[PDB]
Structures are given as C-alpha cells and as structure tokens.
C-alpha cells in the first residue's frame, strides 16, 4: 500500500462483480487488453492440447501466467504493492475483454469458456485457508462450523465421512452448505445432513463455485451487449474492441530450389519423376526418403512433403497414413528395430537393387545408356567439352569420377577438392560452395 492503494483487492480470485472506476491511460488500456487476450488464447490452446487435470496443463499454464504477470499464486505475506498492481491488472483487463467479447453469441461463449477454465485452475491452486477466505469474502457461506458444534455432533460427523479417524477427524474442520448444493454427495449418503445443511469436510466444491461464476458472467455479458452503443462512439477503443478476437499476439518449398543445383543427378532424376507423376516405385521411395533424411528434413517435414506430393496422385488421404507412414517413420528409425538408418552410400546405390522399366532409382551414370546420359547432360546446358569428358569417364566405369566431373563443371570450380562417396556429401559440398 504505497501511494494510492486500498482494500479494493482482498483476494487473488474474484468473481469480477464490481466494474473498475479508475481513470487509466490509453497505453495501459491496450497493454492490459492484449495481455489478457494472450492469456486466454494460451488457456484455450492448452485445453485443446492437454487434459485440464494433467500436470503438463498446470505447468504450462503457470509458465504463461508468470510470463504475462497475472495473479496465480497466493502470498501469505500481505498486500504488497506489486501484488496489488497485478490484481488491478487482472480486474481491469477482464472488463476490457468483456467489452471486446459481448458483441456476438459465439464470442460470448468463447469468452465464458476461457474464463471458467482460468478460474478453475486458480481455484485448484488455493490452499484450504485461502479457499475459505475466498468463500467468505463473496458471501458464499460454505462451512465453517464452530468447534463447539463439531464436538456436539462428533459421533455423527465421524460416521458421516468415509475413512475418517478419531484424531485425524479432530484435526479437521467442516463446512455447512445448503443440501441443494451437495446433491452429488447427499444422493449416495456420504455426508451428514442436519436441519437442511450438509457438513462437508475440507474436489466437487469448485464445480458449485464455477456454476455460480458462470451464471454471473453470462448475465454480465448480456448487460454489456446491452450497453454497446455508448462505446462504439469512442473511436480510440473501436479498432481494438471490434477486432480483438482477430488480433495477432529447412522448408519444403526450397527443396525444389535445391533440386536445381545441389542435388546429385540421381536425386534430380528421382525428383523430376516424382513431380511428373506424383508417385514412385519402392526403390525410388527408399532412395529419395533416405536422401531427404540426410539433407535434414525432419520426420514431420518429410511426412508433410510426402503427404502433399502423393495426395495429388488421386489416392485417398487416409491411405497415405495407412501405408506409407510406417515406411517414412522407419527410414528415421522410429519403429521396428528402431535403428537410425544411414543414407545410402554410392557403393550401395550402384550395387543395390538394379532398376527396371518404370523405375528411376540408382546411379544414372551406371543405369543410364551412354546416349541417354549424353542427352541428359546436353539438356542441362553442360559445355560440349564437359559432356564429352563425362561420357569418356563413364565409358571407363568410374561413375563416381563422372559425378565429380559433373560437380566441377556445374559449380564453376576447376577441381572438386573432395572424394565424392555419398550423395549427402554432394549436397553438403554444393551448400558449402553456394551459401
């Protein structure tokens, strides 16, 4: 309580009943609005991704609350100025978002849901003492029985609560609630009723609290939607509130580019066939998948690329996940023996399965007839002298030397400077030279 504080913010949790009356700045208005929008969007995303009782949900929500500096934990110290500030934030931001989220029923529902979620989390973080404090400050009057009355009904209480020991019971304090709120407890006869009140010990209560909260909040949103014309005239706040819900708070595409320069001729042929027909026989699938694993395409990236490429081949989308997903996972050592299979070496490619009609895998220098290789080299604008030299090398059975000559000619380097013995080595050298 430094300069201009008060008892306006007793507890962390609140039902947001009394609107703020202060005069704030436009900058503060915008900052609070955006911050609470971030908080609510985080709540929604975590609710979709995780189970709200999960520990991951709690950890991530605590991290977000700490990052945006919102009240989430109690403090048995006093009302420190900083704490006051945080609470003030929460109180103002909430109402600002109300103004933002009352125009359309959809929006209203969304707001309510997020708010309820947040409230539940915060309640889940309240110590029993704090919980009672809250239940008192809002006149919820859920009991707290006196010690004398507790001794008066000691035996009844002992027989009411399941698995409660004499001394342990002496160490516990109950609450008095109207039986209309403890339906789920009274119905199976697991809480004592006396004179219309149930005596409930210190999980379900949050539910009742939330019900009350939701009622109130819905009413409030209705009223806000009824008081909209007064705000639309304030241009300063119109761009924000009218559009808050739509407020912003290696790549597959470049692969084709790589195919222009870095890809060795084998991968270039495979990629050309794939983009021509959106389908590869098994050998091509294995070779190209291993190569794209080598360049660095992550499991998610490779899955996305293969899905997008194959979907155009007039096949069911589910068929891909049914069939080719396992192969893609296995190439990355995700299933089966779970081995990080290395990319094919040039020796393997040369000595691997021999390609046949309809296939495009293998080393072109070895699996392409000299006339076809000459035509392909001419197509790539290679100088006639370079094409002749490559053909001469091919006739010498040293296909790796032919690929080295290709690299030298295409990269405008007199000497390759490396012993090409892996397609990934080819791509790495090309990337080193270019980038």
């Amino acid at each position: 309580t430094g300069d201009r504080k008060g008892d306006l913010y007793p507890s962390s949790l609140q039902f947001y009943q009394h609107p703020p009356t202060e005069n704030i700045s436009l900058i503060e208005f915008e900052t609070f609005a955006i911050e609470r929008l971030k908080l609510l969007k985080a709540v929604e995303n975590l609710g979709v991704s995780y189970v709200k009782n999960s520990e991951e949900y709690s950890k991530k929500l605590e991290l977000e609350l700490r990052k945006l500096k919102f009240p989430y934990r109690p403090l048995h110290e006093e009302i420190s100025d900083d704490v006051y500030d945080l609470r003030r934030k929460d109180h103002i931001s909430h109402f600002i978002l109300r103004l933002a989220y009352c125009q359309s029923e959809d929006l209203r529902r969304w707001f309510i849901q997020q708010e309820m979620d947040l409230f539940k989390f915060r309640f889940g973080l309240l110590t029993k003492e704090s919980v009672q404090e809250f239940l008192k400050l809002n006149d919820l009057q859920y009991v707290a029985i006196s010690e004398d009355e507790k001794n008066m009904h000691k035996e009844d209480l002992m027989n009411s609560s399941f698995g409660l020991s004499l001394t342990k019971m002496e160490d516990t304090e109950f609450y008095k609630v109207p039986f209309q709120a403890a339906l789920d407890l009274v119905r199976p006869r697991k809480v004592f009723l006396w004179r219309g009140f149930a005596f409930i010990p210190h999980k379900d209560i949050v539910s009742i609290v939330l019900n009350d909260f939701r009622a109130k909040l819905s009413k409030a949103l209705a009223l806000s939607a009824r008081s909209l014309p007064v705000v639309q005239s304030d241009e300063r706040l119109q761009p924000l509130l009218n559009h808050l819900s739509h407020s912003y708070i290696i790549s597959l595409e470049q692969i084709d580019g790589f195919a222009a320069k870095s890809f060795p001729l084998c991968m270039r042929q495979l990629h050309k066939s794939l983009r021509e027909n959106h389908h590869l026989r098994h050998g091509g699938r294995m070779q190209y998948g291993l190569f794209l694993k080598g360049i660095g395409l992550t499991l998610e990236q490779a899955l996305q690329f293969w899905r997008l490429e194959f979907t155009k081949g007039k096949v069911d989308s589910e068929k891909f996940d049914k069939v080719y997903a396992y192969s893609i996972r296995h190439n990355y050592g995700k299933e089966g023996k779970r081995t990080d299979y290395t990319p094919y070496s040039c020796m393997k490619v040369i000595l691997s399965n021999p390609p046949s009609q309809g296939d495009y895998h293998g080393c072109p220098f070895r699996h392409s007839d000299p006339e076809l290789l000459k035509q392909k080299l001419q197509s790539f604008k290679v100088p006639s002298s370079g094409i002749n030299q490559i053909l001469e090398l091919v006739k010498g059975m040293h296909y790796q030397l032919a690929c080295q000559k290709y690299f030298e000619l295409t990269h405008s380097v007199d000497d390759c400077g490396f012993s090409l013995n892996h397609p990934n080595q080819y791509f790495a050298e090309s990337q080193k030279l270019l980038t």
Binding site: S49, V51, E335, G336, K337
Partner: protein, 296 residues
C-alpha cells in the same frame, strides 16, 4: 462346397482337369449377370449400395415391412424373367445396417414370426469382432458397441453408453481385473516354425519356437498358437515381446502390457466400428480409454 469345388478345380493348376479358360468364362458371365441386375434395379428407381459377386443390397427407404416384402417379390420376379435356370431370392431383411468397407458390415436380420411381428438377430460379416487374430477383450468391446449402434435408442444416449463402457474397460485393464484368458491372441502357422526367416519379427512363430524348445508335444504347420504380449524390460518392439500364457503365469518378471492392449487392440477395432457414426472419432475413443489423445 462340393459343387463350388467342382467349379474351382477347373482353375486348379495341379488338377487332372485344368481348364482355366472355362473357369474364366464362368466368372466373366457371373460378372455380367451382376452388372445387368444392378442396372435393372436402377431402372426401377431403387438404390443399390453393395454387392459381392452374386448379391445386391437395396435401400428400400421404407419402414412398412409388408410393403418391403412386396417390393422384394416384384423385383425378384422381374430379374427371374430374364433367365431360365438362374434364380434370385430374398436372402434377408436387415432392420438396420452398418456398412463399413467392402466385405465388412453388420446388420440386424429380421426373421418374421407371423401376424406382422418379427424377431431380430444380430449378424456380422467380416468385422474384426469375428476374427481370431484380435484379443477377446477387444472383440467383446466391439460387440457391445455394435449392439449399441444397431439399436433404436436415441443417438446421443447411444454415444453416452459407449463412452461409459469404454471407460469401464479402461479401468478393468488398469487394475488388472480382466481374466488372463481374455488377453490371448491366436494365430495359425502356414509353414513349420523353422521355415519362417523372421523368427524375431513374427510373434506367433516365436512362441511356437519356444514351445518346441520345451519338453512337450511339438507344434507343426496348421496348429494354432495362442500368445500374450507382456513387459520384460527389454525395451523392444511389441512384435518381439510375445510370450505363452503359461510362461506369463510362471515367470516372475513378465506382466501384461496393458498399454499395448489399450492402444493397438481395443482402440483400432472400436475406431473402425465408429468411423461412420457421427459424434465418435479416434481421439475421443482414446480419451475415454485413458490413453493420451495427442498421438491419435
């Protein structure tokens, strides 16, 4: 069967009466017949939704059984009018149908008793619930789901019930209350145990090998083997962790791999049974079983 074999031998490579042409012709004619029948049904402005080499399913789009029967008769006669010895008959009236995929469906066959009354009998064709390679637990679950889907209860309630049952199953697995007999998977051997080159990858074969290593009667081609998937700390794939039930009851290091049974036996089956039903999707099912709904 005898008659069918008298046909099939015509295309049996090692038969004394190999006449592949003839058999081909037979099949061809059959195809033609089916096509024609379908065309005729469509010319009658009905709807055809399935047919397997001699049959047609027609969506009567009616609820008056008598009228349906009338239509049956009518179309029956029409078809017969084109053939001399061939005949078509009403092979069943399904009150409800759940057509999932080619040669995989379930229905409630209607057996008439008289005076317009009729009884209903559950019939399944091709579903995993009628396959021996799935754990009995899962099968039962699926059966329950089918009984819920094919009934006349309001859809919402159906869904609710399904959820309840699935959660029950989850608990029964987590507490290990389910009888061990329900965790078994049965598979037959086409060859002898030794001929398989994947003694590790193939689970049933593995179990067979173990049995042959034990001191009892050996298992040979055609003998079904029952195995369970357990935990041993090996950190290997499920396919390599198969074990004979007795072994599980004997060794003190093996425990049933609850996760696996909840993740690859119950969930798949149920999902495939719930694919065309609105309101149930894989994710939800997984959630109801206690699995993580992230990777689903």
């Amino acid at each position: 069967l005898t008659a069918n074999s008298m046909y099939g031998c015509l295309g049996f490579s090692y038969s004394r009466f190999y006449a592949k042409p003839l058999a081909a012709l037979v099949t061809h004619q059959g195809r033609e017949i089916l096509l024609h029948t379908k065309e005729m049904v469509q010319k009658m402005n009905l709807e055809v939704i399935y047919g397997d080499t001699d049959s047609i399913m027609i969506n009567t789009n009616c609820n008056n059984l008598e009228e349906v029967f009338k239509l049956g008769n009518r179309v029956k006669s029409e078809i017969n009018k084109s053939y001399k010895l061939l005949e078509i008959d009403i092979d069943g009236i399904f009150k409800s149908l759940l057509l999932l995929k080619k040669k995989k469906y379930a229905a409630l066959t209607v057996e008439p008793t008289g005076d317009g009354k009729y009884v209903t009998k559950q019939e399944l064709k091709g579903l995993d619930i009628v396959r021996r390679d799935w754990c009995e637990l899962a099968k039962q679950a699926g059966n329950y789901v089918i009984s819920q889907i094919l009934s006349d209860q309001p859809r919402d309630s159906i869904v609710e019930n399904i959820q309840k049952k699935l959660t029950e199953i989850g608990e029964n697995v987590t507490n290990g209350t389910v009888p061990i007999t329900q965790y078994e998977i049965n598979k037959a051997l086409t060859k002898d145990p030794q001929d398989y080159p994947d003694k590790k990858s193939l689970p049933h074969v593995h179990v067979a090998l173990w049995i042959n290593s034990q001191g009892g009667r050996k298992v040979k081609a055609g003998d079904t083997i029952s195995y369970v998937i357990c935990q041993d700390g090996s950190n290997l794939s499920a396919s390599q962790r198969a074990y004979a039930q007795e072994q599980l009851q004997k060794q003190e290091n093996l425990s049933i791999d609850t996760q696996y049974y909840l993740s690859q036996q119950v969930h798949p089956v149920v999902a495939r049974i719930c694919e065309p039903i609105d309101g149930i999707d894989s994710a939800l099912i997984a959630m109801w079983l206690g699995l993580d709904p992230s990777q689903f």
